[PDB]
């Protein structure tokens, strides 16, 4: 009960999904980055006809074209406007196309006299409206009627006329000029295959497909970890190695043609003579010896090495057959793949039950925390060359590090790869079978020596097994794309030494290597995970940097980090400790923004002011000038109390006033009628009544600021006086200058200009994007009887 409680306390801090096996599905459902195609030109603005007024305020007989926001949804308050533009940034990033083919958006120009086409249908509508307009210049009309697309199929190029606002043109031009599709040919596919698989003669790779020159693909982003999750993220790294271990388990091949369990079990029982002993556990000695355990051991060892997930050793000390098998396990598997306590426990059991008793040595009084393992002490304390040399190998058989194709790999000593070191193990244990065991009761000594010989007499099978294990490890490691970082993980995979015994006593001579399709699937899942990891890092970094550069100081980067972890697909975010979440935020802040996202953000940041000032529902401020200022004469309003700028007034930032809560300066200025300019995104009332201006109602709207100590209900009056006002005759039939004491800081819409809006958009005529590159490869394998290792000899040679 207690042990489960403490282990649950630990496991609640690890974001691994509790049914480990189900993680496989979550890893296999990660797809390549979704390819986005543009169906229409990106537009924030549209042309619109608006009424205009003469200087006297009379509505003219013609409308004028102006650029307006297609969706005018801007909020009030500067902070909320910046939030709006962060949301716009996210929208652009999510809808950003990976490639464009303008011909899909090419429609007919109704007024074309030369079979002309334009992109897109919105351009067609605008061009028709301009063509019909009576105020259009004859040269513009003739050009609309004559402007031509150019399709060059030989060059795979298209050019179309488009009408776009300059900001919309910038977005679409960036999309056209920075597409993610590269030319795809057989050389790129062939190089996509891992190099160590292209060089293994056990696999036959062919290219039986012709790619057209129009073939395209999107390169995966296989950048190595910029967050260094193997450093100081214990829970996250534990989850990463667990998920990798599950995947590697899925791809390790199943063993074939094992030794009959009945025969080997009877052989082991006859040799060990356990019934004739006095062991308190007679039945348990040979339990856990079967084909299922041997296959599980094979999978566990290869997958644990592939994922660099730490292993613990679970064994019964009295089971010396398990310890004899553990001798082989420590011979072939690097000692650093095990948790220190388990390695020390197994070595100390081997020393104090088998090896030191064999040589008559005093049992090792080992001390926990010793920089030397029990085997490192034994190597110095043992004089026999067979045992000392095998011990020396075990003491130094740690993973070697090597970078291949930019991927860090944990590789084995060559004596493991060719299986020669098993001979040394054999030598050592043959010596142990000849030893006297001075004080040992003879029946127990005979049993120990016969179990030693049970492992010893499988020398050929063990060499074959070591070579098979190493070859499978190397072939599967060729498919790894992220650096194999070695860290001692919080939790381990528990490996039974009885399963090691099953593998050692039951392996035959049937070679099993990964299937080419298994290798391609493993590599594809690794690539998809790596690419998704990089893309989610880039998305998180882009949003964090945008929020900071947009001065979104109430934004919680924790939600961003949680979304990033959730999109990585392998983390239960509820079990991520807070310190690691904050460390993740800190490391994400330090990374630079990816070029495409940063360019989109720069476009948005540079055009923010223009977009915000185009909105019809927010003004940029209000000047309270307690002097009488003449209403401006604007073509868009008639008479309007509009301020072009804020020159000549002290500015109170409304966002700062809202945040501080300190209304002393604003209250003092309003009480004393001190001229001021309140700056910030404000909703305004459009008042068309001359009587309202004569009543001076625009000066009546600020006192609620002092009453409530709020600024989120401030709605200044923007007068709009023209011939459409019901009381306009007062302006027309009397001698007086319409004035007000307040002005609204707002901008005037930009006029549509055909010359500044007409662009030629260029793209490719047509191509096909492909995603599954390895689907273009025909992949066969040799007969497993003929499979060879790195040394060109057969993986298994006992035949």
């Amino acid at each position: 009960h207690q042990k489960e409680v403490q282990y649950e306390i630990l496991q609640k801090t690890i974001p691994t999904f509790e049914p480990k096996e189900s993680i496989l599905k979550k890893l296999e459902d990660i797809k390549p980055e979704q390819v986005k195609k543009q169906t229409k030109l990106f537009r924030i603005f549209e042309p619109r006809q608006l009424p205009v007024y003469r200087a006297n305020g009379e509505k003219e007989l013609r409308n004028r074209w102006y650029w307006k926001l297609k969706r005018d949804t801007l909020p009030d308050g500067d902070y909320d406007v910046r939030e709006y533009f962060l949301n716009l940034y996210d929208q652009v990033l999510t809808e950003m196309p990976d490639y464009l083919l303008l011909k899909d958006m090419a429609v007919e120009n109704k007024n074309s006299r030369d079979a002309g086409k334009v992109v897109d249908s919105e351009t067609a509508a605008i061009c028709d409206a301009i063509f019909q307009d009576e105020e259009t210049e004859g040269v513009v009309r003739r050009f609309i009627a004559e402007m031509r697309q150019r399709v060059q199929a030989d060059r795979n190029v298209v050019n179309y006329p488009s009408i776009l606002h300059p900001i919309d043109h910038a977005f679409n031009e960036y999309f056209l000029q920075h597409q993610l599709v590269e030319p795809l040919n057989n050389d790129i596919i062939f190089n996509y295959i891992p190099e160590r698989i292209r060089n293994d003669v056990n696999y036959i790779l062919n290219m039986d497909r012709n790619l057209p020159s129009t073939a395209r693909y999107i390169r995966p982003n296989l950048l190595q970890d910029r967050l260094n999750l193997h450093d100081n993220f214990e829970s996250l790294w534990d989850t990463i190695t667990t998920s990798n271990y599950i995947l590697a388990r899925s791809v390790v091949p199943d063993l074939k043609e094992l030794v009959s369990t009945e025969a080997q079990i009877q052989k082991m029982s006859q040799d060990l003579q356990l019934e004739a002993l006095t062991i308190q556990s007679e039945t348990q000695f040979l339990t856990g010896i079967n084909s299922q355990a041997a296959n599980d051991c094979f999978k566990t060892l290869i997958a644990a090495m592939l994922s660099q997930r730490t292993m613990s050793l679970d064994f019964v000390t009295t089971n010396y057959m398990s310890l004899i098998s553990g001798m082989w396990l420590l011979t072939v598997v690097p000692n650093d793949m095990f948790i220190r306590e388990s390695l020390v426990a197994c070595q100390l059991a081997i020393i104090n039950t088998i090896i030191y008793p064999a040589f008559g040595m005093q049992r090792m009084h080992y001390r926990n925390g010793d920089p030397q393992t029990p085997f490192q002490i034994a190597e110095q304390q043992i004089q026999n060359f067979q045992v000392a040399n095998w011990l020396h190998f075990v003491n130094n058989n740690q993973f070697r590090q090597v970078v291949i194709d930019g991927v860090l790999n944990q590789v084995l000593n060559d004596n493991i790869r060719n299986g020669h070191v098993v001979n040394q193990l054999m030598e050592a244990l043959m010596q142990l079978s000849r030893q006297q065991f001075p004080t040992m009761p003879v029946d127990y000594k005979r049993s120990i020596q016969r179990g030693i010989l049970l492992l010893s007499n499988r020398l050929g099978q063990l060499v074959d097994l070591t070579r098979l294990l190493a070859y499978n490890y190397e072939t599967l490691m060729a498919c790894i794309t992220m650096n194999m970082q070695h860290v001692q993980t919080l939790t381990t995979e528990k490996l039974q030494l009885t399963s090691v015994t099953s593998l050692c006593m039951l392996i035959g001579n049937a070679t099993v290597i990964p299937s080419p399709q298994t290798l391609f699937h493993y590599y594809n899942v690794n690539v998809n995970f790596h690419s998704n990891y990089n893309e989610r890092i880039n998305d998180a970094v882009a949003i964090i940097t945008a929020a900071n550069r947009l001065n979104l100081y109430q934004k919680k980067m924790k939600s961003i980090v949680e979304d990033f972890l959730k999109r990585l697909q392998i983390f239960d975010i509820s079990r991520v400790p807070d310190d690691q979440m904050y460390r993740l935020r800190d490391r994400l802040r330090l990374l630079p923004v990816e070029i495409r996202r940063l360019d989109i953000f720069n476009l948005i940041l540079m055009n923010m002011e223009q977009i915000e000032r185009a909105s019809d529902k927010i003004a940029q401020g209000v000047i309270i000038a307690y002097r009488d200022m003449q209403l401006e004469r604007d073509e868009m309003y008639g008479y309007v109390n509009i301020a072009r700028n804020l020159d000549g007034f002290q500015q109170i930032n409304l966002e700062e006033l809202m945040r501080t809560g300190d209304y002393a300066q604003i209250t003092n200025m309003l009480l004393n009628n001190q001229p001021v300019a309140l700056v910030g995104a404000l909703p305004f009332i459009t008042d068309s009544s001359v009587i309202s201006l004569v009543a001076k109602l625009d000066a009546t709207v600020f006192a609620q600021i002092v009453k409530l100590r709020k600024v989120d209900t401030l709605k200044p009056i923007l007068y709009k006086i023209n011939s459409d006002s019901n009381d306009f005759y007062l302006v027309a039939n009397y001698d007086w200058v319409p004035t007000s004491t307040t002005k609204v800081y707002k901008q005037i819409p930009q006029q549509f200009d055909f010359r500044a809006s007409m662009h030629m958009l260029t793209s490719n005529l047509t191509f096909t994007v492909y995603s599954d590159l390895l689907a273009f490869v025909s992949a066969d394998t040799v007969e497993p009887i003929n499979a060879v290792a790195f040394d060109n000899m057969r993986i298994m040679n006992e035949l």
Partner: protein
């Protein structure tokens, strides 16, 4: 030598470019290089100067990274950068002086001072960047 030059060049860039009001895009690559330099030098002890009247100076590096989140640099950013830069400039000047006053008949091209010998280690090669002089 390449590492000492890279330190000096990074510091000169930081002095010339980390200025109040400047767009962060003007400094982003430099900020990355500077943070790399800080990370590499953190936790390292150096001793310069025990020859002639050159005084013994001990150097310890425990500095925070510069921020990346601003749009334009402000006074706070510049002050933190300036304190770190001042310490690093003092260290580089002392290392250069320590190397300039030493000579060897056998391997006079190789580094002579202990600090430059330490900086020749692989754990500092990350500092290395544009060698344009």
């Amino acid at each position: 030598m390449d590492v000492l030059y890279s330190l000096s060049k990074t510091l000169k860039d930081a002095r010339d470019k980390i200025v109040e009001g400047t767009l962060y895009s003007n400094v982003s690559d430099l900020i990355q290089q500077f943070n790399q330099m800080i990370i590499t030098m953190n936790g390292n002890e150096f001793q310069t100067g025990g020859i002639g009247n050159l005084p013994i100076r001990n150097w310890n590096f425990d500095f925070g990274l510069l921020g990346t989140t601003l749009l334009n640099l402000d006074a706070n950013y510049v002050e933190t950068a300036r304190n770190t830069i001042d310490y690093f400039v003092d260290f580089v000047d002392n290392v250069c002086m320590d190397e300039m006053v030493r000579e060897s008949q056998r391997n006079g091209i190789a580094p002579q001072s202990d600090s430059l010998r330490k900086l020749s280690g692989i754990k500092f090669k990350r500092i290395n960047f544009d060698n344009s002089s």
